Amino acid sequence: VKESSFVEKMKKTGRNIIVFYGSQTGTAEEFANRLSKDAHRYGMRGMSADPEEYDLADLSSLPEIDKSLVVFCMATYGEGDPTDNAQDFYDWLQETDVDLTGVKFAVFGLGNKTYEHFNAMGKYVDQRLEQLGAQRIFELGLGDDDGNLEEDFITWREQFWPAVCEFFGVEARQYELVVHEDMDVAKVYTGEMGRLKSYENQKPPFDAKNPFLAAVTANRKLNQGTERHLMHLELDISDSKIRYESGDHVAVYPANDSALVNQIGEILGADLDVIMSLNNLDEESNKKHPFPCPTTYRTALTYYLDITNPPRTNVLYELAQYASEPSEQEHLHKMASSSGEGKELYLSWVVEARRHILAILQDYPSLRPPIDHLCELLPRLQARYYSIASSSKVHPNSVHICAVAVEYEAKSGRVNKGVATSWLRAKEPALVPMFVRKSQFRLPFKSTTPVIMVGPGTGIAPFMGFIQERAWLREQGKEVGETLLYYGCRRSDEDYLYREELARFHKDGALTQLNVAFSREQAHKVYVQHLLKRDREHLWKLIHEGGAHIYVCGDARNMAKDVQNTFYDIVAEFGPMEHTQAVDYVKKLMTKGRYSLDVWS
Ligand SMILES: Cc1cc2nc3c(=O)[nH]c(=O)nc-3n(C[C@H](O)[C@H](O)[C@H](O)COP(=O)(O)OP(=O)(O)OC[C@H]3O[C@@H](n4cnc5c(N)ncnc54)[C@H](O)[C@@H]3O)c2cc1C
């Protein structure tokens, strides 16, 4: 059920600039919001909208508004596909014939070079609209998350507005605090995501808005060493009605470290246990609150807000008014610079030093902002995803998670800890709000199809699922093909994940070949690519004659692309080909669903 034409919403609300956002983990939204807040005191007036709830065909009616401009802040996910919320826009856009002549636009893509289809989504919207007759007002920004998406945006945004002012010639808070002294507690959100008492009155089906509360059945340390901590949790989804398959992902809604929460209240001299509400007061908007209200400051900072990731430019700039010392006040105002020492200090003192909000406050004694303004500026705490480590056919009422607990010492001088991983780490077998989202990472249909799994480190997660299901089919008497696991870890006795289980699978015929590279047991580093190169001739027979499927799960920055280069080589060698010939052959494998990835950062 979608909303009424945004064109009418604009005409009725006196706005001319509308900014849609294709976002998954809320970054494109954070930008869309900042951009539509720029116009407000730059001559014009805009609004950020979710394309998933509007009919984008109404773009043709956009030019009915004088000086109209539409901006798209799109993120690309997977294999250059759109984000969930931008899916319907994508497909409409893809095969529509609506003449958008008169429509003015500007697009900002959010991507990451470590992936192949860099800003594939952004580039599409940009090229497409123009083909439909619309005119580009400003060049397509191509932000890169590998470097610094924040600085790419600050830069584009810096040239965008001046361009919008020339063409159009104009030449030129967001929330209210309502403390609720008198109010029943059963009307206060205690950190569910959907409706009130949803974590209590649990009703299927469960999803992003209505996450199920699975209780931790098991939580064991897979880690045999001590240097790191790798864990294995078994979540119970007994009567959730939830359906999952090997290769699917499971999101989890974490809770900020309470200790960090109480300190923010302390240093800021704020009472956290204050039932309150931040009403968006532009009375005519469907975005009434920044996060579920009414609720306390404590509940907000703990389940709804992001208090760990380094702050972005806009929040540092707004809090600058709260610095009593001019010296510090100016540093906050300068970190917003797209160049110069202000830009230098941001990347060093914040991004690189991994200074979260609390740190900034401790390292800048002047900063004593109001907690309500802080809760407005702070981005929302997102859910972390984990490749399911079990098979629905052997564990239908349980979702297994394999994860390495993040924790390191930052240049800020403080020990930072992973939000979800610390959380999950402490979950003594204790509910966990989760949901499940389908992927394309799947085993082949014909059990006879051989599979080559390359998963070093925690990238073995989805493979425990594939292996359980692969052995299960063998119990059914079905004819299973070769199942090869190319795993990798540091030292045999430090972090060999599922050593015992894998061994059991190998001898039971389930796991055809258990190939493990121990990168630190010798002087030279042995990696899974070396084992791949070692078995090149056989690998080629499977890939070339058996129609084998390859699955590379894990690190996206290095491992994934290194493994690709090896397959390019194996191909270029066993079927006489020049380099370039082999790369197209391999990419053609990805086209037919023969080479599947499940990488991250
Ligand atoms: C599709 C998908 C599947 C995933 N599957 C798995 C999985 O199976 N197993 C698994 O463990 N993870 C997996 N992840 C990663 C997982 O979602 C989380 O990123 C991870 O669990 C850490 O989250 P966190 O909340 O603990 O840490 P956060 O609080 O989010 O902190 C993480 C951030 O800290 C920074 N960082 C980390 N170490 C350092 C350092 N030493 N120096 C500087 N900066 C640093 C980086 O910004 C990193 O993203 C997956 C991600 C995706 C997209």
Ligand SMILES: Cc1cc2nc3c(=O)[nH]c(=O)nc-3n(C[C@H](O)[C@H](O)[C@H](O)COP(=O)(O)O)c2cc1C
């Ligand atoms: C699983 C995953 C897949 C991604 N796939 C791509 C991709 O195909 N191409 C690209 O340019 N960026 C890709 N990215 C990067 C995101 O687009 C980038 O982080 C962006 O800032 C996300 O914005 P959001 O927070 O609005 O989703 C991917 C990120 C993840 C985690």
